[PDB]
Design a protein around this nucleic acid. Structure first.
Lengths: 91, 91
DNA sequence: AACTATTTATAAGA
DNA sequence: TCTTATAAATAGTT
């Protein structure tokens, strides 16, 4: 962008909403690209701060959800806290 | 990148695995930024071609998924063909 | 595992 | 609505 922005909650309401709309599309675009390039199944679920739902899925959301609730082996499980710690070690 | 790539399945198996590892992190990083910048809650399910699970959640995976199952209102739902057609018609 | 030359994303400007 | 300058991601290289 015209400026670097800190990764912290955008305080201006309108800018938070505009950013939300644009970055949500960019994330869904990158999910679509990852699913085609690497032949994977991806489901993305977003609740905004008003608890409105936005969903993406590379194919059938319900089958991916079902297969998720049946998984029993350990697996990569990241959250914001882990990601933030990963980025702190790289910068 | 050094070259543009078309969004089609990477057929060389080692390159597909490298691109997968790298772009999965970038996707999770962008999800972390979206959730922090815009104060939203995100769940991300990824199954690779060998049906192995990789997951990200901004805070609480199963909480977000459970909220999703109880959401009855009409909401935006995107698929790969939706996104590919949004991208194609941007010309 | 890193680097880097390019492409892609997007913060602001218009 | 729609560019544009700039930041970020990443494909191919080392």
């Amino acid at each position: 962008g015209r400026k670097k922005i800190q990764i912290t909650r955008i305080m201006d309401e309108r800018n938070r909403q505009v950013t939300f709309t644009k970055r949500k599309f960019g994330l869904m675009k990158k999910a679509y690209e990852l699913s085609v390039l690497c032949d994977c199944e991806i489901a993305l679920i977003i609740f905004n701060s008003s608890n409105k739902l936005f969903q993406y899925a590379s194919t059938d959301m319900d089958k991916v959800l079902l297969k998720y609730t049946e998984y029993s082996e350990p697996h990569e499980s990241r959250t914001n806290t882990d990601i933030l710690e990963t980025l702190k070690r790289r910068e």
